[PDB]
Structure formats: C-alpha cells, structure tokens
C-alpha cells in the first residue's frame, strides 16, 4: 500500500465483491517500503533516489 | 453524508478491550463482591475521567 | 391410592407411580418387557439396551405402542397414559423431544440410531394412545418471526445429493410412520 | 450446507430438517433449533459487513478517528510502520513516527545485544 | 496416532484393516459420500480435539504425523466408546 485510495476497499470490505464473496472488512493496516523514503529515516540521500526511481507493477503481475 | 454534526463525540478515544443512570448511588463491598462487577459500577455508564480513573 | 413399580436394566431404573385399579395389568407388562431385551454390559453401548432412563422409558412405550388397537379401546390404554405423562414431565420439561434428543447425544455417550429410535417411540405412544398435537408449540424460532426479528425461507434440494436418496424416505417412514402414513399412502395410490 | 458456505458472513442462519445430527463448529442447524423452546432456537449467524463496520469518532478536543476494532484498543488511528530491519533501526525514526501520533515497531533484527538495543530503547523514550 | 487413525477410519467404511492404504486422503476412499466424510471429521474432532485445514484434502499417511506431535497414548471420548461397544455389543457374555 501507498495511499488512502488502494486501501479504502480493504477497510470497508467491499474488496471481496470483486471475487464473489460476502464483504470482508479489515480492522488496521501496515506500511512498509512506502515509508523508505521519510525525511527523518537514515537510508542514504542517493539510496532514496534509487527508490523513487523505481516504476514499480500492479497486483496482477508482481510474480514476474 | 459529508455533515461532520453526526460524529459521535467522546471524552477520549482508547483503552477498549475489543471481547466485550443514577446521580446519588451507594455501594456495600461484601467478601464476595466480583472485582470486574465491582469497578463497572464505580466507572458509570459516561465515558469520563471516573470511567478512566476505575 | 397408588402403587410403585420399577422399571429396570443394569444400573439405571425409573420408579412409576401405577394406580391399583390396574396392576395386575402392568406389572405383567413389566415380566414380559424385562426378558426381550439382553444383559446389561458397562457403558450399555448395546443399540437395543437403553444408555440412559429417557431411553428406557422410550423402549417400554414403543413394546407398549405395539400392543395397542387404534380403534378397539384395550386394556393398555390407561397403562400408556400414565407413562407419557412421567415421561413427558420427568425428562422433556416442557420442551420438545427433539431438543432432548440433541442433549443426550452431546452429554451422554448415546449414537444416532440410539437416538432415532427415542423420537419414533414417543411419537407413536402420542398417537397411539390419542393425544394428537393441537398445541401451537413453543417456538423459540417462530416467536421471533411472530415478533419481527426472523425472517424465514425454506428452500428444496434435488437430484444428486446423496447415492441413494431412498434411505432417508426409509428413515423417515420408520420413525415417522403415524404422521406420513397417510400422506405416503395417498402419493402411491 | 451449500448455500451456508455461498453466504457464510451474511448473517444467515441455514437449519437442516431433515437430518438430526449435532454440528461442533456450531455453522449452521439440524431439526432441534426449529423445535426448540429455550434460547437454543434463536442462533443468529454473524454479518461481517455490520459486526466490523468502519465508523468515526471525536474527540473533547475534537479530532477524528477511523473506529475499528484495533484502533479501539490503542487510541490511534490503525495505520503501524512495521519492523524493517534496516528502516527501523535507528531510534530517531521510531520516535518522531511516535511524535507523529502512530504506532511503529523497533526491529531488533539491526541489534546484537541486549546492551546495545538497552541504548538504544532509552533513546526512543528521551525523544518522544 | 498412525495405527488408532487407520482403525477409526477402517471401522466408520466398514472395511478391513489393510483394504485401506494410508497414502490415500479422506475425500478419496470414501464414495465422495460426504456425510461418511463428514462424520469421519466428526470422529477425529472427537478423537485428537484440533484439526488442520481441509484434513480431507491431505493423505492419512501424511495427516497422521500432525495429531502424533499433540497426541500422546491416552484414547479418549470416541474410540473408547467404540470399544465399549465391540465388547458389550458382540460375545464375551459373561467377562466385561
């Protein structure tokens, strides 16, 4: 996750229409290499520049 | 329906486990006495500085 | 003016309040139904012995339901009576025979076919000696649809559900067979 | 049966009459629950969409939060930066996502000894 | 828990102690009956108290090591009540 707008259907639990299931809600949620790149976190200036630089790939693809 | 009016308002929001009017009461601790049943009623049904303290 | 008679097997019994009047009758009964059914052996696991004394209440109505004439009324019918409204005040409280059948398969160490054979014999001793149910039960489920808290749909299944289906119209005819044997009946005709 | 599993979440209760049997996962009925005289009959299924509902809330001072479950207990918003080795290391990090008014995880993966990591714990508690 | 695993599904199919291999998942030696299956799952809920996830999807061979790591000797509700049967129901009539 990176935003309210990819995580808002977890929290409703509206998700689960997608794949024909009753809705699913979620109760909280983690955030891990979205935070890489904080002001006040120690990974280096041209380390943070390497991140962002990174396009990254939706959910249907990742495997590859 | 976009109106921030319809929020419930609450003292403090927090320290609720997720498992679960009267204005001159008194209370008799006996020997029996369930210590949970006990603070419940000291705490009152308003979320407060009472219902924190207890 | 009462008498006690004890119906018994191994090492459970129930005590029955039989009137004087008839006696001579009853206890008779009891010799006959004491002999049928064989030696007690622990746990009474044995599917024609009774596990507990609702059971063995049950097995006696059910020998006493056979002997009866639907229409003749007999010698048995004052003796039947008299042993569903024990039965029916000791052991079932009011509720229905399904809710003790459920208790005694999950407390007990009763089976399916131990179980079975209880609600076929009550309901034949109900009928038997004629006291049909014109009661509107007490529902827990249909209290809260009368209030307006359920809401009830009943669906139907078909084809494929089981290997043989017909099984279940055995079972049910079995143990139902003083309630479907008019309906039966009239779809084979 | 199989219309339970199809709508399990719905708040649905599916009662079996044909079969008396007992279920010990307690999913769905058999012929008893219909019969029933006792509080025995009256078994209601869970609906997800309704028992975890997200909701919002104020505070005295009138800030909001997204009332779940989680956030209940903690009295913050349900939003943690987990334990990342590298990342959360440092304790100037984990402090200002404190400072911030949510919830993160020291990772002792970047520790060596319970001295070391000692330090660095009373450094978090210095700052924030 | 390998040997009392065989014996409670061997009995409940009314089958022979080697009729059955134990490479083989519940789904698959019963007649895709479904209550036989479910009333087996109902046994060792019964038997061993917790089960893993689809236990009629994985072999008795392989889901026999599972119950032998939180099971130790002590036969419990449903396998004793079968052998109270087996005894009292067939013919030893006088020695219990």
């Known amino acids: 996750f990176?935003?309210?707008?990819?995580?808002?259907?977890?929290?409703?639990?509206?998700?689960?229409?997608?794949?024909?299931?009753?809705?699913?809600?979620?109760?909280?949620?983690?955030?891990?290499?979205?935070?890489?790149?904080?002001?006040?976190?120690?990974?280096?200036?041209?380390?943070?520049?390497?991140?962002?630089?990174?396009?990254?790939?939706?959910?249907?693809?990742?495997?590859? | 329906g976009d109106d921030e009016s319809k929020i419930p308002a609450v003292e403090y929001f927090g320290g609720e486990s997720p498992v679960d009017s009267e204005d001159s009461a008194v209370f008799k601790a006996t020997s029996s006495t369930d210590e949970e049943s006990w603070f419940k009623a000291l705490a009152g049904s308003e979320i407060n500085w009472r219902h924190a303290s207890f | 003016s009462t008498r006690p008679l004890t119906l018994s097997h191994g090492s459970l019994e129930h005590v029955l309040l039989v009137p004087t009047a008839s006696f001579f009758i009853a206890s008779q009964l009891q010799e006959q139904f004491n002999k049928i059914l064989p030696e007690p052996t622990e746990g009474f696991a044995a599917d024609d012995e009774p596990t507990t004394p609702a059971e063995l209440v049950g097995k006696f109505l059910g020998y006493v339901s056979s002997l009866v004439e639907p229409s003749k009324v007999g010698q048995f019918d004052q003796v039947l009576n008299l042993c569903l409204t024990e039965f029916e005040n000791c052991y079932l409280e009011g509720n229905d025979?399904?809710?003790?059948?459920?208790?005694?398969?999950?407390?007990?160490?009763?089976?399916?076919?131990?179980?079975?054979?209880?609600?076929?014999?009550?309901?034949?001793?109900?009928?038997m000696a004629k006291r049909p149910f014109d009661k509107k039960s007490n529902s827990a489920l249909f209290r809260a649809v009368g209030e307006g808290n359920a809401q009830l749909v009943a669906i139907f299944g078909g084809q494929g559900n089981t290997d043989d289906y017909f099984e279940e119209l055995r079972d049910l005819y079995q143990t139902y067979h003083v309630l479907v044997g008019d309906l039966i009946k009239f779809s084979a005709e | 049966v199989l219309t339970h599993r199809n709508k399990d979440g719905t708040g649905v209760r599916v009662i079996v009459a044909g079969t008396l049997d007992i279920n010990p996962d307690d999913d769905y009925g058999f012929k008893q629950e219909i019969f029933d005289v006792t509080s025995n009959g009256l078994k209601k299924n869970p609906n997800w969409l309704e028992e975890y509902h997200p909701k919002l809330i104020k505070n005295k001072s009138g800030k909001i939060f997204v009332e779940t479950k989680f956030s209940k207990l903690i009295g913050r918003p349900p939003l943690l930066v987990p334990g990342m080795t590298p990342c959360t290391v440092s304790p100037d990090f984990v402090a200002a996502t404190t400072n911030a008014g949510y919830t993160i995880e020291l990772a002792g993966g970047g520790y060596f000894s319970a001295a070391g990591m000692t330090a660095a714990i009373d450094s978090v508690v210095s700052q924030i | 828990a390998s040997l009392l695993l065989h014996v409670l599904?061997?009995?409940?199919?009314?089958?022979?102690?080697?009729?059955?291999?134990?490479?083989?998942?519940?789904?698959?030696?019963?007649?895709?009956?479904?209550?036989?299956?479910?009333?087996?799952?109902?046994?060792?809920?019964?038997?061993?108290?917790?089960?893993?996830?689809?236990?009629?999807?994985?072999?008795?061979?392989?889901?026999?090591?599972?119950?032998?790591?939180?099971?130790?000797?002590?036969?419990?509700?449903?396998?004793?009540?079968?052998?109270?049967?087996?005894?009292?129901?067939?013919?030893?009539?006088?020695?219990?």
């Open chain 1, 2 to 64: 990176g935003s309210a707008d990819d995580t808002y259907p977890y929290l409703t639990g509206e998700w689960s229409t997608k794949f024909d299931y009753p809705p699913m809600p979620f109760d909280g949620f983690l955030f891990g290499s979205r935070v890489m790149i904080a002001k006040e976190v120690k990974t280096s200036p041209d380390a943070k520049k390497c991140i962002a630089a990174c396009t990254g790939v939706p959910d249907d693809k990742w495997e590859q």
């Open chain 3, 97 to 127: 025979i399904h809710a003790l059948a459920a208790k005694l398969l999950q407390e007990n160490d009763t089976t399916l076919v131990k179980t079975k054979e209880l609600i076929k014999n009550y309901i034949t001793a109900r009928i």
């Open chain 5, 9 to 96: 599904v061997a009995h409940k199919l009314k089958k022979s102690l080697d009729s059955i291999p134990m490479s083989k998942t519940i789904k698959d030696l019963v007649g895709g009956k479904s209550t036989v299956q479910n009333e087996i799952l109902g046994d060792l809920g019964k038997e061993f108290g917790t089960t893993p996830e689809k236990p009629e999807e994985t072999p008795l061979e392989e889901l026999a090591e599972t119950f032998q790591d939180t099971f130790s000797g002590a036969l419990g509700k449903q396998s004793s009540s079968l052998l109270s049967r087996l005894i009292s129901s067939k013919m030893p009539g006088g020695f219990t």
